[PDB]
Symmetry: C4
Subunit: 229 residues, 4 copies
């Protein structure tokens, strides 16, 4: 009946069986990289793949059939429905296998007891300031990318062509690798005063990326210092 199926979806036996077969498919996705193992057991492994994908679709849509609107409030349901919906089509560049990320559900069972609850609570509570931090960083990258494209546009072939590639190059200047010997020394061969555009930028955006660490450390100590009042 309706009540019996809503019991049987929440059965720990069959749910742990879903976890069993999904970590099984995770390790045979680890085995698919070894081409010889796919030469040896190929039809068996693609049978494993196709069967666990169709029964994965079966169990997710049965989770819909039991909890048509009751399935809405769970962010883990947001996670697994993202995994089903975005990775529904396999006629693409083989990237179905990110559904292995479904096994992240098992790491709910480690979030409870051994002191990582405070860390994940800090990670959850750091959201409404870190989003404003990344919006400020997007504004800085926007204005500096448009300034860099107005300056170093024509005479530079590949690092400042479009808006997206100029954003990419200034992002790589933020990641702090070879801005001198990959970006500056070709640029000072033409423009002798392009250094005064980079030197504030490498300061300000890495300083904001340090301020993010400051914000998450004070957010991870606010819950600690809550315990004295």
């Amino acid at each position: 009946m309706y009540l019996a199926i809503t019991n049987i979806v929440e059965s720990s036996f069959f749910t742990k069986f879903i976890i069993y077969l999904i970590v099984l498919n995770g390790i045979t996705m680890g085995l698919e990289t070894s081409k010889t193992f796919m030469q040896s057991f190929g039809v068996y492994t693609t049978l494993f793949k196709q069967i666990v994908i169709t029964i994965f679709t079966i169990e997710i849509i049965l989770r819909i059939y039991v909890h048509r609107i009751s399935f809405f409030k769970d962010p883990w349901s947001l996670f697994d429905f993202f995994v089903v919906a975005i990775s529904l089509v396999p006629t693409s560049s083989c990237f179905e296998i990110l559904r292995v990320l479904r096994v992240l559900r098992l790491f709910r069972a480690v979030t409870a007891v051994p002191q990582v609850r405070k860390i994940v609570s800090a990670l959850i509570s750091v959201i409404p300031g870190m989003l404003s931090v990344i919006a400020l960083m997007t504004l800085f990258f926007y204005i500096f990318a448009i300034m860099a494209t107005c300056l170093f546009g024509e005479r530079f072939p590949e690092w400042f062509g479009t808006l997206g590639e100029s954003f990419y190059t200034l992002f790589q200047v933020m990641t702090l690798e070879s801005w001198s010997m990959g970006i500056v020394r070709p640029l000072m061969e033409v423009y002798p005063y392009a250094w005064v555009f980079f030197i504030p930028f490498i300061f300000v955006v890495t300083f904001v990326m340090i301020n993010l660490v400051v914000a998450i450390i004070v957010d991870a100590m606010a819950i600690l210092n809550q315990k004295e009042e």
Copy 2:
């Protein structure tokens, strides 16, 4: 009258209209990078640019006409007058478009509610120590640049020529990229005991740049630990 004009400058309708047209020309500068869009809609877009910068000078000087000395106390007024006055000349290397940075005014509206007030209060209160930190860093770069120019002056063409380029090269050694395979291995081909000039330097200035992070984290927790007394 005079009072009515001082009311009409503070009208939320026309002020939000200024914000509307400034984010409009901000995304128009986002569109100027795509040169096909400038090929198609060019006269319209440059009409947009010229008209909104003319009325931008109009509204800023009207803000002067209403608050001749009352406009002095606001650091946001310092900001917008910097943006207008330094970027008043367009007969230069195309860099007018940093007045898009004016839309930073809109991010006052996010500074109030969602917990970033403590972060920006930490960033405001970190000033009178971080200025001494950057003065110490400037002194270290000064003495190490003059020592580097006395040592590696003649026999190296471009990394230690002037004072500014030597300061630049030691700054890049502080940014920690290819000091070995871009700076050391040509240097040890001539001077076999020039390593002991770098190895203290890469330690001391990166250690001070870590101490800056220490100072801003303790300043971002001082406001937190103030709330128990």
Copy 3:
């Protein structure tokens, strides 16, 4: 007798003599690098090596003979038995000399007084969260290595061949050096939309490596704020 030998193993004279000869062989392996010193005093030096490893095996197995099961509870015993048992064979790639690491026992005597007790207590207490952090990081490297092998498998010769080398290359992208000019610019010569695989990855795993620093700083202040209640 049995009791007298269990006293003489704990004799401070002979135990500090073991410490004397083990720091002696530490600086002897510091001297083995200079091959002229091995040309001059070589037979004496290898005599020193063979005699101290023979008597080292003697004293460790005498520590077993006195404390057959009483020797179990010490993690320092785990350390020295690892050093003896894993490096018992010298017919290998010359790597016996990591038994010099035995002198780490002497740094127990600095762990007591001068304020490093709090640091080593933080390092001991940071274990049951940092293990979950490294398990999460291993899962991320697993899924991103298999996704990288699906995407950049065939047409790239050495950076994405097996599973281990693809894991290695994405680890090097985590170490943040030349992902652009060593990994991206050959990749964008073929795939024009392979950047959107890297740009989330370099964000998420370096952000988790920053979160590790957050966890160890709040663990090093929890013992501090313990002292007010």
Copy 4:
């Protein structure tokens, strides 16, 4: 008399005159890099240098003559006597000009009021743990340099020759630049299992360099939490 000379050494007029001429020689050592300025005003400038260094020796030895043993307790006296005594000889590799670092004495006057007293107190109090941290790091570099020299000794020409150069190369691996494309990819062309020597090392020593930041942040908050009891 004797008392009057011990007053006249502490005269604020002549002491501020020493500070005046030492910042004067600081800025003209900033000017010596411009060789045209040395072409124009050269004899005057070297006259300035020679006269103020001989009167610098005069005032330092007068500080000795007034306070023969009373000059011992000051670490600033340790600083200025280091500056005079180690840099007394000018017949060397031109490196006299580090006595410009004497102007650091003026930054005592900024250590008092504007909140940096807590930062420099944290920097003073971080000593007896950070020395043990750097001793541990020296031991790690010692054992890993000897292991790297035993493994990659013969077939590698310049990165693993002596003990000092192998220490230097593993230090550069700690500085995290081109360990892959400068150190690994030549090494995996011969040894296919040398990666398992690097991958623990780049983890452990950068993790200890992060733990240094942890120690200095908790030391900079211990003085903060001192103010509640």
